[PDB]
Design an enzyme around this catalytic site. Structure first.
Site, mmCIF file in Angstrom:
data_model
loop_
_atom_site.group_PDB
_atom_site.id
_atom_site.type_symbol
_atom_site.label_atom_id
_atom_site.label_comp_id
_atom_site.label_asym_id
_atom_site.label_seq_id
_atom_site.Cartn_x
_atom_site.Cartn_y
_atom_site.Cartn_z
ATOM 1 N N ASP B 37 174.574 -25.954 77.261
ATOM 2 C CA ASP B 37 175.834 -27.008 77.144
ATOM 3 C C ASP B 37 176.342 -26.672 75.603
ATOM 4 O O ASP B 37 175.728 -27.014 74.547
ATOM 5 C CB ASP B 37 174.932 -28.208 77.232
ATOM 6 C CG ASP B 37 175.967 -29.226 77.169
ATOM 7 O OD1 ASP B 37 176.707 -29.509 78.283
ATOM 8 O OD2 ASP B 37 175.946 -29.994 76.098
ATOM 9 N N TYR B 42 182.327 -28.918 68.991
ATOM 10 C CA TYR B 42 180.921 -28.615 68.542
ATOM 11 C C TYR B 42 181.118 -27.616 67.343
ATOM 12 O O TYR B 42 181.671 -26.560 67.519
ATOM 13 C CB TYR B 42 179.752 -27.935 69.549
ATOM 14 C CG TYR B 42 179.252 -29.273 70.350
ATOM 15 C CD1 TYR B 42 179.467 -30.704 70.104
ATOM 16 C CD2 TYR B 42 178.445 -28.734 71.392
ATOM 17 C CE1 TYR B 42 178.879 -31.409 71.043
ATOM 18 C CE2 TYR B 42 178.155 -29.713 72.414
ATOM 19 C CZ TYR B 42 178.213 -31.215 72.248
ATOM 20 O OH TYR B 42 177.792 -31.851 73.135
ATOM 21 N N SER B 260 167.630 -27.972 65.936
ATOM 22 C CA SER B 260 168.343 -27.901 64.663
ATOM 23 C C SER B 260 167.519 -26.674 64.139
ATOM 24 O O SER B 260 168.138 -25.936 63.045
ATOM 25 C CB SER B 260 168.399 -28.911 63.764
ATOM 26 O OG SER B 260 167.078 -29.367 63.666
ATOM 27 N N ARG B 301 181.625 -45.583 75.800
ATOM 28 C CA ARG B 301 182.482 -45.844 74.878
ATOM 29 C C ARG B 301 183.988 -45.647 75.173
ATOM 30 O O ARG B 301 184.408 -45.442 76.425
ATOM 31 C CB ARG B 301 182.491 -44.970 73.746
ATOM 32 C CG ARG B 301 182.572 -43.435 74.109
ATOM 33 C CD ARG B 301 182.675 -42.764 72.618
ATOM 34 N NE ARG B 301 181.456 -41.914 72.565
ATOM 35 C CZ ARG B 301 181.200 -40.702 71.860
ATOM 36 N NH1 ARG B 301 182.268 -40.419 70.832
ATOM 37 N NH2 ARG B 301 180.186 -40.284 72.109
#
Ligand code: NAP
EC number: 1.1.1.2
Lengths: 324, 301
Positions: B37, B42, B260, B301
């Site tokens: 994904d 990004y 990460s 949102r």
């Protein structure tokens, strides 16, 4: 401006006799309000019947009184086209009127494809049998599906949603309210007193004792109300509000019922300019006259508004669903 | 079967360098997982770029890796037709692929009428640029409007929704999940560790006291149930997603694993394979959710 007030006629013909029902309508109209809410199922047909005999001239050009009714998939009926037509046509006769101002789908019939029901509503509208279409107890995303279908098919769109909303029942705020704003529906709140729980007259242990005839004990739909609101958390929240009322106002403080009503009219997300409204409920003329006076009261002090928020926070995780 | 695992690639080119990113993909594929994904936005475009340079042969016949990307109303772009096209065409270039398997609307553009965006998505699908359409961060009722428009217009329907969901973040269950089941969309869950809160590494010293009280309840149940061989808090939270949530592996539902670092990814890949939890621990997570339900962040949102 504050939200409008709509008269709930659910008890007319049930706990309320013709005399008291007629008196209630007169009292409500004298206060300057105009909209009355009934349904095919209310009082097994007597609510509509009583209202249709008041010589109000419902549905006729010149009537200042606006009448709403509803078709429901209950009493052995569905929301199939024939059953929607049957109910509305029956309601018109009971109401002695040629058209109702607002016609609701009372709650979903998940066994009948919605587009079929909507097509029937459009046909009934084209015949002149109702002015506006309404929804009640449909989930936000069902409302959006309905409005999109109506738009694409050129059918009358719903312009009113009637749903459960009170100071400690706010599920509608998150997803439903923005949907309604987007698609142009005004919201009419029912259960503004949580069926009477927000008057403060009960205590949790009460269900374990004998109780007088009321919404929660002895009503044909009492079980529905126990499951909806009879939880320890609702009771602890009310308790916080009663405490803040005293702390802020002193022994001359507004009553719990006054507080709950004022919350609806001054501190909720309802907006008068959007056409939103509160549907008052009552089981007697006395209650109605009291409630009609409470509507006119002003805002509450912040500490009490904060207490209602605290109470909501306590019960949010077990709020009854506004949809079925 | 259990829910699937999707590699979240957002940190490729931000907190993660090329070397680590490549290794991360190998580790993920080695475990038998296949969907990756990413998004146009990004890492300032470096996530797609790094993935494109890995030699995976994305979007091609016989590729065993499935790729997802997304278009967003960011960087001066909107979800107007020309901007949706621009983003997908850019993604295809960066990912070095002829199509992606899944293309999302990343989050709503309330300034562009949704039917305009949808028509563009249809056109792009007719050009063969993506296989399935996805939605992320749209409210349930917006999903229904979209599906209804697509059905009426004869346009590709969305079949995947990506949204926030974890043991103490369950707002999506009430309204979103029934809508998705109705219209045939599978659900990919992100933020399975609630920003790190569900790792148990943070203590009271935005998260409130009731949040840490919740974590304490779960820690207590873990110790009472399993004693010295209890799953860690992070393990329990992952196991909840895979075994005790409303995700259904037979509906194609999945969990997005973020990373990460390569190490963090290898740790998390191992957790995915762990078993169910005992009922008392599941009950504790429910209690923790009940403490914070009233202040759940919105999934839209
Ligand atoms: N669309 C729907 O699904 C739906 C569902 C519910 C209602 N509604 C509509 O909404 C209307 C109002 O809803 P609701 O009746 O549930 O409203 P509510 O105000 O939450 O509940 C009304 C009940 O509260 C008690 N109460 C009201 N005023 C009081 C006072 N002054 N003092 C003491 N107790 C008082 C009475 O209970 P006791 O009877 O126990 O005395 C009364 O029957 C109904 O008439 C109906 O038109 C629609």
């Amino acid at each position: 401006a504050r939200p409008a007030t709509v008269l709930g006629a659910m008890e007319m013909g049930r706990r309320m006799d013709v005399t008291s029902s007629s008196a209630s309508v007169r009292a409500f109209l004298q206060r300057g309000h105009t909209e009355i809410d009934t349904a095919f199922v209310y009082a097994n047909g007597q609510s509509e019947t009583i209202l249709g005999d008041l010589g109000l001239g419902l549905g006729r050009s010149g009537c200042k009184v606006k009448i709403a009714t509803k078709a429901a998939p209950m009493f052995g009926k569905t929301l199939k086209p024939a059953d929607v037509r049957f109910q509305l046509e029956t309601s018109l006769k009971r109401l002695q009127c040629p058209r109702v101002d607002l016609f609701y789908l009372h709650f979903p019939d998940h066994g009948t494809p919605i587009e079929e029901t909507l097509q029937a509503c459009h046909q009934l509208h084209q015949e002149g049998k109702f002015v506006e279409l309404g929804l009640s107890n449909y989930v936000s995303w069902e409302v959006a599906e309905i409005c999109t279908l109506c738009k694409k098919n050129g059918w009358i769109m719903p312009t009113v949603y009637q749903g459960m909303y009170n100071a400690i029942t706010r599920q509608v705020e998150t997803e439903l309210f923005p949907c309604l704003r987007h698609f142009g529906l005004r919201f009419y709140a029912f259960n503004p007193l949580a069926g009477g729980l927000l008057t403060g007259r009960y205590k949790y242990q009460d269900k374990d004792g004998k109780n007088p005839e009321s919404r929660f004990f002895g009503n044909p739909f009492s079980q529905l109300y126990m499951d909806r609101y009879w939880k320890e958390e609702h009771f602890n929240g009310i308790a916080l509000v009663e405490k803040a009322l005293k702390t802020t106002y002193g022994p001359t403080a507004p009553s719990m019922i006054s507080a709950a009503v004022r919350w609806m009219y001054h501190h909720s997300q309802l907006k008068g300019t959007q056409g939103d409204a509160v549907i008052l409920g009552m089981s007697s003329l006395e209650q109605l006259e009291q409630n009609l006076a409470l509507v006119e009261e002003g805002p509450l002090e912040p500490a009490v508004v904060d207490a209602f928020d605290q109470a909501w926070n306590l019960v949010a995780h077990e709020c009854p669903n506004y949809f079925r």
